[PDB]
Design a protein around this ligand. Structure first.
Ligand SMILES: [Fe+3]
Ligand code: NA
Ligand code: NA
Length: 52
């Protein structure tokens, strides 16, 4: 699944992960650590929402 950051153009795709910051491809949103933030704008998990 994919989630948009409300605050910038970034999209977290679970099939991509966030590898530059230590999150492997295939990591589900539910499994991102509580201190994970948007790689571009620093917004927290509470500022992400599912998109298609
Ligand atoms: Fe962002
Ligand atoms: Na969790
Ligand atoms: Na970073």
């Amino acid at each position: 699944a994919k989630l948009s950051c409300k605050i910038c153009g970034y999209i977290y795709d679970e099939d991509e992960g966030d590898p530059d910051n230590g999150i492997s491809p295939g990591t589900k949103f539910e499994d991102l650590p509580d201190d994970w933030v948007c790689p571009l704008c620093g917004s927290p998990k509470s500022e992400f929402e599912r998109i298609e």
